[PDB]
Amino acid sequence: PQPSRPRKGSLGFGPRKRSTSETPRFNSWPSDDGQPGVQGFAGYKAGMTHVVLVNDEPNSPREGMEETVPVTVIETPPMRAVALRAYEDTPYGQRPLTEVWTDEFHSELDRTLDVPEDHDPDAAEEQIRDAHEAGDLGDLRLITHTVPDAVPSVPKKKPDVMETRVGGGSVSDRLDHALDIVEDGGEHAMNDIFRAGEYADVAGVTKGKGTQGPVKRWGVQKRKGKHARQGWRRRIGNLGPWNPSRVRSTVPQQGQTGYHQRTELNKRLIDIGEGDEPTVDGGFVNYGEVDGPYTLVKGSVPGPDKRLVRFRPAVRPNDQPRLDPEVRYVSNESNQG
């Protein structure tokens, strides 16, 4: 009767085309519960090493015992929240009302931007407050960006700009919290929003695979037995039935594989730090030597070394936070063995 089988590959991440902005753009931000705060930070994937910890799980019998855990190194130097964007609530969702900027910019922000010369912060700010006064202020996000220049391993100086939502406090309170941050230089570190032990959401653009066949792309079988010698090996059975007299867009086909945005959930921040503590002997292969601001994110992270990864407090956490896990050992062992 022909046994059952789930279709090959998932339909959720479609179409499987190359991404528009290599810089991830979250499409969902955390809820407003705590104090006013920015809802995410970003960095650059460095490489992988393992670490030994002390089991935090109060339920696991292993609780208290050492345990070897893999970790992706991500250099996360200080970013600069260069502006504050306001959204007005209109009959057609949210729309950018107005932004508030600064004076002190990063020496090389003009490599990507058309840096302001004459902005009227106080006035623009007024617009926001009058809109809040009217009861039309939606959510408050801060135009942000990185200092790629800070990271040596990364060749790019030309900064990666991305907006991030701010929440937590009451509209008014967080609004001010925003301005406060911005009304300086916008400098902030990962510890300004995270703490080791907290589960985050790392989003990134996958590794570049170019065009690939159905087998690799949609995980379809290869021709089997005798069927793999007649002149067909990685080609599928057919593109559909007689009728519908067409090719349904749900049949696994050759195409662009990789370079897609992915938002990898519940990534636990195993340790936030600064220095050369996670670096490897010889240097992180095809990256370099780490020294300074960073994060040790548990497990894999979407993307290749040098790619901009983005963090965010877990929108859908499953377990309870175990702040600051006891990190006994971090591997310095070479990655060329």
Binding site: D89, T90, P91, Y92, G93, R246, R248, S249
Partner: protein, 142 residues
């Protein structure tokens, strides 16, 4: 944003279809019409079945596609479109010269067309275009 509308119509408590029939009619006569407060418009019958029809109209589609509105905004617009030869020259012009809105983005109160109104004091089985929209999945932006 600005729309120099000759006619402004208020759909509040008015039978969607009937109102549409006239708007498309006038539009076919060179009348730049504007429907207002459509979310408050209405269609008679068992909500349960009035919904199925619109909920089914969402399920329908394929590679070619069969887009169907959900916002009370849209529904009305497409309804009107179904009363005009929107494929033709004359029709595209007419249909394109008609716009529907959530609430009233204007100053002027919208006039009410004859026969198009309902009386809640005599009816109990009818539905807010917005209720339909809320059910379809739309986010109440009105």
């Amino acid at each position: 944003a600005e729309f120099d509308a000759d006619v402004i119509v208020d759909a509040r408590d008015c039978i969607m279809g009937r109102v549409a029939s006239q708007v498309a009619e006038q539009a076919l006569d060179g009348e730049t019409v504007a429907v207002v407060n459509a979310e408050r418009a209405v269609i008679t019958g068992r909500e349960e079945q009035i919904v199925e029809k619109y909920e089914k109209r969402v399920d329908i589609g394929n590679d070619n596609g069969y887009f169907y509105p959900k916002r009370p905004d849209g529904i009305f617009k497409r309804t009107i479109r179904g009363m005009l030869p929107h494929k033709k020259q004359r029709g595209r012009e007419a249909f394109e010269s008609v716009r529907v809105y959530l609430g009233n983005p204007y100053d002027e109160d919208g006039e009410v067309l004859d026969g198009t109104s309902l009386d809640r004091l005599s009816n109990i089985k009818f539905v807010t275009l917005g209720e339909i929209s809320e059910t379809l999945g739309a986010n109440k932006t009105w």
